[PDB]
Amino acid sequence: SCSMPLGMESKAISDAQITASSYACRGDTCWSPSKARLHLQGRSNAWRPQVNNKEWLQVDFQKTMKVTGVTTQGVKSAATSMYVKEFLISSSQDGHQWTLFFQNGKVKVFQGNQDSFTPVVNSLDPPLLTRYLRIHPQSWVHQIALRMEVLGCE
């Protein structure tokens, strides 16, 4: 029913297809957008932006895709849970202009995670046909950290 991971977890989506406003590094490990993949493990296994600055993560499908859902997840840095609790969705055909996902005129706030480990699936109703998807963290616990998956087909 058009509900398959689009490749965040399986790396069917490449690391250049995933970009962000910014990301953080230490030594040789970077909380790059390329690490924002569901259930990813390792040193810096999530996207984390440089603490400052409007923050968002972006996925370029390189093709118009039907997106019916987004799965979000936090991460633990040491024993510190970091996750996005609330977020917005915007869509884009070129990657420069962005249209927010409006609920009846008003941008919809998506209820995100309540912990750092459990994935939470948010269904997009109706689905989106986009080449680009962006997630805009609105509120978070401790800090902004994201692993995610996109659900759809095509």
Nominal resolution (angstroms): 2.1
Tokens of 101: 């996902």
Q: How far apart are the first and last CA of the chain?
A: 12
1: exposed, middle or buried (C-beta count within 10 Å: 0-12, 13-18, 19+)?
A: exposed
Which amino acid is present at 22?
S
Burial of 99: CB neighbours in 10 Å, binned 0-12, 13-18, 19+: middle
Token pair for residue 65? 């895709």
Residue in this structure with the two tokens 């996750």, named with its chain if needed? 83
Distance CA 22, CA 24 (A): 7
On whether the CB atoms of residues 58 and 91 are closer than 8 A, the answer is no
- The one-letter amino acid code at 65 reads M
Distances (CA, A) of 93 to 58, 86, 110, 125, 149: 12, 24, 22, 19, 19
Question: Technique behind this structure?
Answer: X-ray
Helix, strand, coil content of the chain in percent (nearest 5): 0, 55, 45
Question: Encoding tokens for residue 152?
Answer: 């759809």
Domain residue spans of the chain: 1-154
Just give the CATH number of 1-154. 2.60.120.260
- Residue 55 tokens read as 């923050």
